[PDB]
Design a protein around this ligand. Structure first.
Ligand code: ADP
Ligand code: ADP
Ligand code: ADP
Ligand code: MG
Ligand code: MG
Ligand code: MG
Lengths: 371, 371, 371
């Protein structure tokens, strides 16, 4: 039958059936519990809400994110998220569908051990498999050679591949993601007097970040222009009728990706990370990786990130190379699209982990089979 | 000439001269205007009163604070308060003495912009400077490495410093301080039949709070003791001659610091704020910050506050670490003492913002010369 | 006059006087600068910190190493380090003492050219000499025959010397050293949850490696045993009282020496490289090199490394030969010890490059005199 492809992101959940062109159900990965006191009978029920029905009620809920930087911290909540996706979104009983999850590179082993343990023990899936996200992103584009940048809500990592032969000694992982951008935005917005303090208001700040932010091609010059003129201002309207206006915050926020010292981090931005990853491979294949620089992840949707990366990576490499950022319009869902492509290959059906093997080897087999 | 220090707090204006060890003047920051029609000739002058001459007469006045959570909400009254200070209380022509002011972190820029503009244009002080309250509080103790929990009247913030290099990425600020506790105290006194509603009677409940309230080392145990005994109850007499009595209110009111969910807020109490601030820092410097939990501000005078914070953080942090709380006896004027020390340093005389610089750059200078 | 000796290694500086027993000062070579912004007047000085003091304050600094793979990559900082070693650790006037140095084999000539230039012109030392490290190592053992293995922090090299005649073609230089092992340990410590990314955390991962890691005597059996139980597990406490546990990460890191493919390289482990070095020398002298096998360098201090090397070499060479690994307990400082021995020999005082000869011939004379 058709196997599920559930891409549990750090902030979003994508689910669907192998082969399709787009995820069937997409909903945020949060769980909210009421905090005030219910003074009425038979109303205000359901001690816990998940996804959209926790977004719409968020005003009176305290919203938790089960995953934290690509690591599942609250397993009791993650079981709930998976239950939601399997039953209330997809409307399937997973006991007849194989599954194909995803993980970030360099993620702690116990994370995926417990992942597969739950999948086999609670949901009784006949077989399943766990694939790194960079490999799926590289499938989606339909090629074999390139270096993936996959920047999501929890983790930003890079993975270079040459003709199907991975180079695990060049994979670099940098935990500066969309969540940290939103949490820095909440802090900088006070400079104007708009105090967002609650977990609910954090979703409002995420919405402002998605709607209005954009990466400056040249940070210093846009600083000067924005300070010297009001042509860069823009206004947002809160759910309660208020109106908030923001000026240079719009590009001050995404710039954290390229200058992690804005939030105290010591690393070098994503551009330097990619350059270092490419300069760690063999000398012959650096030329090809310079030319097939793939992008992915929702966080790479900031208008102008492709051009800023092009600039900041052409400034580094030798002047005789062709540095070519690939930025598909659907790069938000490239991981899932790659997963769906993968699961439908006939020659991949011998890479599943069958329930029979799990019943005979324990969860540790996930390492002896998967990547 | 000698530099003045004017720590125009939210509850009490502390104004004095650099080089001294105590403020030359303390008075409430309230401006009241009468409300009952006058009927006598030879009277009825001076429609507005400030400070103590408004506190005494409040029987016939409506009192209003100009600062609201460390943000000035009505400048027309703040000019009046500064004028009162300089001319009637300190009695110095301000245009012959530099002045040093204090501002809480994450405070909107416009606040300090107008703060500088008023001083330079109206009072024409030859020079001035604005400093964050936590750094002055650190100066007051003679240290150079600690984490300062300043709980003023409006705002409670937390600024970890290590060897003089502050760590802005890990600062906190919780809008929960004196006035909120006074409001909660008024709200829970109603349970006994004491209905205070007016702006005058809030200045009776504030005194009740300052006299009878304390902090419980174990809130549940105190609740049980109150339920099963009358030992905790205490007696207080109103201005007109009535006597009131309050029981568990005494330790309920300050408990709102550690469980903000009492007054509805999502945020976490002061102990969790401090632990989060310490953790965010570099792993090698948490050791020293654990042992320098300085305290300041008026609201940090409740009995049992230092001991309670000691217990809480010692319960949160790793068991091996030595947690210490530093609560100097005069910690109510810690910020003013810090400013007094700072204004005297010879190395500091170069950091004044001069009137010429203000003319050269205007209000935007305060974002370069001052922290 | 007395001659100084300074083994400018990659990871640590071993300085001191000729003729002594042990180095006078052994301080890490790192020039750090503060990354945060100071706020407190009255302290926060000394824009850069070098060596020990840099290690002490590394909580708020970025630590860069001036030497990388035994080639001075940053002269601005190496000059500061030399100035420190002379004027604050040895506390001597360098202009009065002949100064010996060291350099790895097959090291670019511009390196030592500028080394001699700086020593003769900036410090105005009277005479100097750049002796290859392995030869000094072999002096320190008293021998005059054998095959030196010296695994510094940056570079690993073999130098077969027979009867005082160094055979230059059989030399081998392998850029696998301590820092590579540190980085690989940092990489494989993510398998349990940890994240050491800052340059400050490199100086803690190196210490975990120095304290716990050990070489296996048979890697496959070690892995099989480790998988069986938790007997091998050991626990180490970070600077802030948090405890971490590691199992097979203790001996997967040192195994990089004997299977360089772990960190992505192609070349064969140190044992195959030594066997290949011997098997390029004349047949008449392979017996003498087999039975004399000197060790050196800090990285050769893993418990059991000598035994593993002996096993692996005997596994290749003909059965008749008697292999012997010489591992003096003081081998970490062998290079400096040999330098001090050499600087004292009466026959040596003619090898000096005098200031007059430097003036006559320029920097290039160090190629014609120094081996
Ligand atoms: N159009 C957009 N522009 C900018 N940021 C966006 C946009 N859409 C989503 N984001 C941000 O990217 C993150 C979600 O992207 P996503 O790829 O799904 O993360 P994850 O790996 O967990 O699945 C969120 O932090 C969100 O704020
Ligand atoms: N001994 C005390 N106990 C409890 N609350 C106090 C005490 N002294 C002052 N307060 C309260 O703290 C506030 C004033 O203290 P203060 O430190 O000066 O605040 P601010 O930051 O505005 O300067 C007032 O609300 C006052 O009621
Ligand atoms: N007992 C030990 N075990 C393992 N590694 C060690 C030990 N002592 C030092 N090292 C490593 O050796 C390196 C420094 O040794 P060293 O020989 O002096 O290098 P260099 O020649 O540049 O001076 C460091 O990276 C350190 O991690
Ligand atoms: Mg993702
Ligand atoms: Mg205050
Ligand atoms: Mg060496």
């Amino acid at each position: 039958t058709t196997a599920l492809v559930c891409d549990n992101g750090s902030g979003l959940v994508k689910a669907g059936f192998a082969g399709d062109d787009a995820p069937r159900a997409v909903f945020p990965s949060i769980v909210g519990r009421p905090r005030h006191q219910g003074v009425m009978v038979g109303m205000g029920q359901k001690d816990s809400y998940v996804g959209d029905e926790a977004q719409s009620k968020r005003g009176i809920l305290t919203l938790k994110y089960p995953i934290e930087h690509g690591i599942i911290t609250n397993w009791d909540d993650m079981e709930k998220i998976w239950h939601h996706t399997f039953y209330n979104e997809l409307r399937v009983a997973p006991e007849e569908h194989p599954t194909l999850l995803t993980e970030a590179p360099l993620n702690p082993k116990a994370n995926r051990e417990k992942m597969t343990q739950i999948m086999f023990e609670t949901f009784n899936v006949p077989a399943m498999y766990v694939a790194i996200q960079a490999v799926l992103s590289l499938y989606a584009s339909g090629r074999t050679t390139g270096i993936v940048l996959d920047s999501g809500d929890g983790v930003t990592h890079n993975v270079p591949i040459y003709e199907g032969y991975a180079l695990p000694h060049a994979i670099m992982r940098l935990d500066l993601a969309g969540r940290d951008l939103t949490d820095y935005l909440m802090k900088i917005l006070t400079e104007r007097g708009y105090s967002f303090v609650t977990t609910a208001e954090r979703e409002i700040v995420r919405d402002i970040k998605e709607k209005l932010c954009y990466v400056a091609l040249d940070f210093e010059n846009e600083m000067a222009t924005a300070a010297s003129s009001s042509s860069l201002e823009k206004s947002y309207e809160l759910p309660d009728g208020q109106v908030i206006t923001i000026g240079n915050e719009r590009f001050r926020c995404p710039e954290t990706l390229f200058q992690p010292s804005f939030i105290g981090m010591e690393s070098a931005g994503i551009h330097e990370t990619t350059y270092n990853s490419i300069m760690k491979c063999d000398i012959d294949i650096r030329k090809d990786l310079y030319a097939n620089n793939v992008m992915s992840g929702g966080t790479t949707m900031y208008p102008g990130i492709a051009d800023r990366m092009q600039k900041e990576i052409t400034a580094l490499a030798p002047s005789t190379m062709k540095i070519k950022i690939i930025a598909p319009p659907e790069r938000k869902y490239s991981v899932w699209i790659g997963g769906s492509i993968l699961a439908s290959l006939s020659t991949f059906q011998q890479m599943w982990i069958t329930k029979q093997e799990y019943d005979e080897a324990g969860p540790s087999i996930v390492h002896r089979k998967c990547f």
